[PDB]
Design a protein around this ligand. Structure first.
Ligand SMILES: *[C@@H]1O[C@H](CO)[C@@H](O[C@@H]2O[C@H](CO)[C@@H](O)[C@H](O)[C@H]2NC(C)=O)[C@H](O)[C@H]1NC(C)=O
Ligand SMILES: OC[C@H]1O[C@@H](O[C@@H]2[C@@H](O)[C@H](O)O[C@H](CO)[C@@H]2O)[C@H](O)[C@@H](O)[C@H]1O
Ligand SMILES: *[C@@H]1O[C@H](CO)[C@@H](O)[C@H](O)[C@H]1NC(C)=O
Length: 705
């Protein structure tokens, strides 16, 4: 009655094989209020399944203390998908990558005794078996696995370990074995998948991720061919362009897979959404996870991509009865043109006509009728006769993004952040420099490195008007340099190379000089071999040239630390906290001023358009609406990179259809309709870089052809 098994062909849901069209919708990147409309948009788009990760570090802020409220009501989210007649692929992880802060591991886990991440390690295995079992027991509890009549038809253990395992060697393989056996062991009564495991143990199905994976094949023949991440674009990194992937090529990629015994494919992403707060953003990942997905960050339809995939699904579902009762058989149709024919003993016939030439439309002869195949396309013939769909012919009207203000420029108040300096009574100190994750435990992006640089009165630069050289080398990711109160320097990294060096002459004078270094993180690293062990914050070396001695090693003094900002320790983002300091009303409003808090109240704009914040006036920091973390703003970083005009045809890569070069890397910042009330809306912004808060205006998203 209720069963999920599999064969060499496809997934068997209820004794019936199925070709499963699926979409990734990460729950914590939406509001619970948006969930059902997004899920409905998915249903209308031709999706059978909704895929998501579980967010380990969202769910356990500290050991044993869990959070499944609001955006993290996972059981609610799965139930809502079930409510929509769609299935669920639950990729538990707990490592999930997903451009998510620290890959999803809680930071506290890093510091458990004897701990190592993703390897045959006792502390790690225990904590991981722990979380995976808690989630599965929560899922089992309300019969949410399909064997019990629920939506979950599949689960994922780890995420993309194959590459990491190929480098760690024997521990890695001894952990891949372990992870598979001690997840299957939870007896969920539905299959377990692993993506990028050329070596996944029976009975775990290895899947792939990529732009194209028509070449792929499971690690044993009685496993079906499964595509867990059809990338629908790419992530937007801070100071990067907005990566698009064209819909004629996504169609083309999916059809290339399904024509070749493809049975499960999942768009990553279907809905991208927002990295809300300082707990979401992976390293350098911008607040927008829009991902050029078929639903944009704001849940509106990305046309014609949405419409064009909707039609492809329809064309697949007309083909499905053939697809499930035969196998993909091939027949050359010319130099670079092919035919994949699903012909059932009963009489069903589905035919995929392919044309792999990236330049020239080609006409082929199939079963006596002519067919014109536009270049880099496939024509779907669900009857083997009428081409009802072609992955180049786009029959959905486009829709372009328009942001149009409403609410009017608000009246602002300011508050300035203390620029702290060393004090002979600081408690948190050491000789030499400490790593940032170690000190902050990721309670805040901000860490103050402070020390005393004494300068003897007989110095060369105290004779000739001249400044000593300051050189600071920090693991990342932003660094502000403060001398005796005033700001001497500001340097920042990219995703690829987050390490930085500040070099510059610095006005010191005889006696004790104050050095205060503000190192900031932009989320934690989320991917790579041993990514967890990477450093952040100032580890040096730190020198001061132009002295008599010659060049002073400042890394070998007493340094003192202070975690995070005062405004944070006050929580000036919440209504209670924001009424506790003297705000600077009137016209003295700090303009183009570093380390400044801002504050305005406004009324919900008109009706039912999605909203955002224009902040191209500002530099960098965080936004909060009504005490909830909107996310990080960083319009000060200008999109670096190639932005050639783009053709659908030919092999794709992230870099192909890059957009928005020269502009702020994210101008607009998403604000849920569900986070506003009619009036009394407390906007609070921390500006870390300097900007003019008068230019902050609310906007409405809408689209037209
Ligand atoms: C789809 O799957 C079928 C089944 O695996 C593939 O056809 C097989 O081809 C191999 C040799 O290449 C034979 O050993 C199998 O017995 C074949 N099965 C059948 C039913 O013919 C087929 O190649 C796959 N499709 C594509 C496009 O590769
Ligand atoms: O949206 C990005 C996507 O990355 C996937 O991971 C990929 C790896 O499987 C592959 O080996 O390298 C890619 C970069 O070249 C990338 O790291 C994740 O599976 C997925 O969660 C998501 O982060
Ligand atoms: C981490 O911090 C602890 C306690 O605050 C300290 O004992 C240790 O030296 C630090 N280690 C680092 C930065 O590697």
């Amino acid at each position: 009655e209720f069963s999920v098994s599999y064969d060499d062909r496809a997934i068997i849901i209820n004794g019936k094989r199925k070709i499963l069209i699926s979409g990734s919708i990460h729950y914590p990147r939406s509001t619970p209020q948006m969930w059902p409309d997004l899920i409905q948009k998915a249903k209308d788009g031709g999706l059978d399944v909704i895929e998501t990760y579980v967010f380990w570090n969202g769910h356990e802020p500290s050991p044993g203390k869990y959070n499944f409220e609001g955006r993290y009501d996972l059981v609610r989210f799965i139930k809502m998908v079930q409510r929509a007649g769609l299935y669920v692929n639950l990729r538990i992880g707990p490592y999930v990558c997903a451009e998510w802060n620290f890959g999803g591991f809680p930071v506290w886990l890093k510091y458990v005794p004897g701990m190592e991440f993703r390897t045959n390690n006792q502390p790690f295995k225990v904590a991981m078996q722990g979380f995976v079992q808690k989630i599965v027991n929560m899922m089992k509890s309300e019969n949410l696995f399909e064997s019990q009549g629920g939506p979950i038809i599949m689960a994922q253990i780890e995420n993309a370990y194959g590459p990491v395992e190929w480098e760690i060697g024997a521990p890695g393989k001894a952990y891949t074995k372990w992870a598979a056996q001690m997840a299957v062991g939870l007896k969920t009564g539905v299959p377990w998948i692993m993506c990028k495991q050329e070596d996944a143990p029976d009975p775990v199905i290895d899947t792939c991720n990529g732009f194209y994976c028509e070449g792929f094949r499971p690690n044993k023949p009685y496993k079906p061919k499964m595509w867990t991440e059809v990338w629908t674009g790419w992530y937007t990194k801070f100071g990067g362009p907005i990566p698009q992937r064209p819909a004629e090529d996504i169609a083309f990629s999916v059809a290339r897979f399904v024509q070749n015994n493809g049975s499960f494919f999942n768009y990553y992403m279907y809905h991208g959404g927002t990295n809300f707060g300082r707990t979401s953003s992976g390293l350098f990942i911008a607040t927008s996870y829009d991902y050029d997905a078929p639903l944009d960050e704001y849940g509106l339809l990305n046309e014609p991509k949405y419409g064009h995939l909707r039609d492809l699904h329809k064309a697949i579902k007309l083909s499905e009865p053939a697809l499930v009762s035969s196998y993909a058989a091939v027949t050359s149709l010319g130099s670079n043109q092919e035919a994949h024919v699903y012909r059932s003993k009963s009489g069903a016939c589905a035919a995929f006509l392919s044309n792999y030439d990236s330049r020239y439309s080609v006409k082929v002869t199939f079963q006596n009728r002519p067919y014109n195949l536009p270049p880099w396309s496939i024509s779907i013939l669900p009857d083997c006769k009428t081409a009802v769909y072609n992955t180049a012919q786009v029959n959905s009207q486009s829709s372009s993004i328009k942001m149009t203000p409403a609410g009017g420029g608000l009246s602002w108040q300011s508050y300035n952040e203390e620029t702290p300096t060393a004090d002979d009574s600081d408690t948190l100190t050491a000789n030499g420099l400490w790593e940032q994750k170690n000190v902050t435990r990721d309670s805040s992006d901000y860490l103050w490195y402070m020390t005393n640089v004494n300068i003897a009165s007989n110095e060369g630069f105290l004779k000739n008007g001249k400044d000593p050289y300051l050189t600071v080398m920090s693991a990342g990711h932003v660094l502000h340099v403060f001398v005796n109160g005033k700001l001497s320097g500001t340097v920042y990294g990219t995703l690829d190379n987050p390490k930085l060096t500040y070099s510059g002459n610095v006005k010191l004078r005889a006696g004790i000089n104050k050095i205060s270094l503000l190192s900031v993180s932009v989320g934690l690293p989320n991917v790579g071999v041993h990514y967890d062990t990477w450093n952040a914050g100032v580890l040096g070396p730190v020198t001061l040239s132009g002295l008599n001695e010659g060049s002073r090693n400042l890394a070998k003094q007493k340094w003192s630390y202070k975690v995070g900002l005062k405004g944070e320790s006050l929580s000036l983002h919440s209504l209670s906290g924001s009424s506790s300091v003297e705000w600077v009303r009137g016209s003295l409003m700090a303009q183009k001023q570093p380390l400044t808090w801002y504050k305005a109240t406004f009324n919900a704009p008109g009706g039912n358009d999605p909203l955002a914040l224009d902040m191209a006036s500002m530099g960098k920091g965080q936004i909060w609406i009504n005490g909830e973390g909107v996310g990080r703003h960083w319009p000060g970083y200008i999109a670096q990179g190639d932005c050639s005009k783009c053709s659908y045809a030919g092999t794709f890569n992230e870099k192909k259809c890059q957009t928005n070069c020269g502009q702020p890397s994210q101008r607009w910042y998403h604000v849920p309709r569900s986070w506003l009330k009619p009036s009394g809306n407390l906007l609070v912004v921390f500006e870390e870089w300097g900007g003019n808060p008068t230019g902050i205006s609310l906007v409405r998203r809408s689209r037209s052809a």
